[PDB]
Design a protein around this ligand. Structure first.
Ligand SMILES: *[C@@H]1O[C@H](CO)[C@@H](O[C@@H]2O[C@H](CO)[C@@H](O)[C@H](O)[C@H]2NC(C)=O)[C@H](O)[C@H]1NC(C)=O
Ligand SMILES: *[C@@H]1O[C@H](CO)[C@@H](O[C@@H]2O[C@H](CO)[C@@H](O)[C@H](O)[C@H]2NC(C)=O)[C@H](O)[C@H]1NC(C)=O
Ligand SMILES: *[C@@H]1O[C@H](CO)[C@@H](O[C@@H]2O[C@H](CO)[C@@H](O)[C@H](O)[C@H]2NC(C)=O)[C@H](O)[C@H]1NC(C)=O
Ligand SMILES: *[C@@H]1O[C@H](CO)[C@@H](O)[C@H](O)[C@H]1NC(C)=O
Lengths: 49, 47, 49, 49, 49
């Protein structure tokens, strides 16, 4: 199986042992864009444009 | 007031090509005669 | 073989020849605060912190 | 084409013809799990690298 | 057509019933599938973009 690639922007979470736990594609949904612009998986309460 | 570069440098890099291993072929247990003079070409390696 | 932080700098590495780890520490680079009178031979230096 | 080495085939492996060893820039062997089920790879280039 | 040298012409035909198939699965980067580690960098307990 082959799929094309594109220059995207992803957010990576590292644990204490340096193992990637979860990732969020910033071009998937609006909550993903909020997590991208806040640089965190638990964004605070606010109005994001 | 004002706020030197030491010449000591540390250069480490992983090689991209294997070793030539010329000493293994020269120290072989089989020594060819002057009439044979076997030949081995070494290329794309580090020595 | 290298250790990086969230800011993007390197703070450690591993040697593949001796199998020993190290921590890269930044080197000192600071200035001196000197107090000088109207007519004096040498001012008074102060290395802060 | 690629010829099976476990059970053989009717053809011979022929994908390059070189009398001597050509100029190479990279050469290294890697090992993986033989009993694996699926493999994943990533190939890309940027700025000639 | 890849190369420009004649190496074998034993059995060459024109088959016209070979169509690639499309998989039924999609890309899911939630658990980490589809993401790759950095070249040689290690990150411990950090969230990197
Ligand atoms: C550094 O650690 C690596 C990993 O264990 C060592 O590589 C091993 O060396 C032994 C001895 O020859 C082999 O039996 C293993 O198969 C090697 N493992 C791998 C993954 O290559 C290496 O020798 C160590 N280096 C030093 C200087 O101690
Ligand atoms: C990587 O592995 C391949 C396959 O095991 C090696 O190719 C072999 O090379 C030897 C020496 O030239 C030949 O006698 C064998 O017939 C080759 N095997 C195959 C399947 O082609 C290759 O040399 C290895 N590379 C390194 C750098 O060790
Ligand atoms: C991993 O990182 C988290 C987030 O920075 C650390 O959690 C903080 O720990 C400090 C010290 O105990 C607390 O004062 C903060 O309130 C914590 N923040 C959160 C959001 O929990 C955690 O300690 C780190 N773990 C290790 C082993 O370094
Ligand atoms: C290779 O994969 C099989 C099946 O997934 C597994 O049982 C085996 O432990 C793996 N080998 C190693 C060295 O982990």
């Amino acid at each position: 199986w082959v799929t094309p690639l594109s220059r995207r922007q992803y957010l990576l979470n590292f644990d204490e042992h340096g193992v990637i736990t979860n990732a969020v594609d910033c071009s998937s949904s609006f909550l993903s864009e909020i997590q991208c612009k806040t640089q965190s998986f638990a964004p605070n309460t606010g109005v994001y444009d | 007031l004002s706020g030197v570069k030491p010449v000591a440098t540390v250069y480490r890099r992983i090689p991209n090509l294997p070793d030539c291993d010329i000493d293994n072929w020269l120290n072989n247990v089989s020594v060819p005669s002057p009439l044979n003079w076997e030949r081995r070409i070494f290329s794309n390696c580090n020595f | 073989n290298l250790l990086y932080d969230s800011n993007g700098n390197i703070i450690g590495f591993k040697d593949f020849l001796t199998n020993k780890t190290y921590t890269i520490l930044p080197c000192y680079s600071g200035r001196v605060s000197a107090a000088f009178y109207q007519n004096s031979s040498s001012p008074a230096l102060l290395y802060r912190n | 084409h690629t010829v099976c080495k476990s059970k053989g085939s009717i053809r011979n492996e022929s994908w390059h013809i070189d009398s001597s060893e050509p100029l190479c820039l990279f050469k290294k062997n890697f090992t993986y799990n033989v009993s694996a089920d699926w493999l994943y790879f990533h190939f890309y280039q940027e700025r000639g690298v | 057509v890849i190369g420009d040298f004649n190496c074998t012409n034993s059995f060459i035909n024109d088959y016209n019933k070979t169509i690639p198939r499309i998989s039924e699965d999609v890309v899911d980067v939630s658990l980490g599938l589809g993401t790759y580690y950095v070249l040689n960098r290690v990150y411990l307990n950090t969230t990197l973009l």
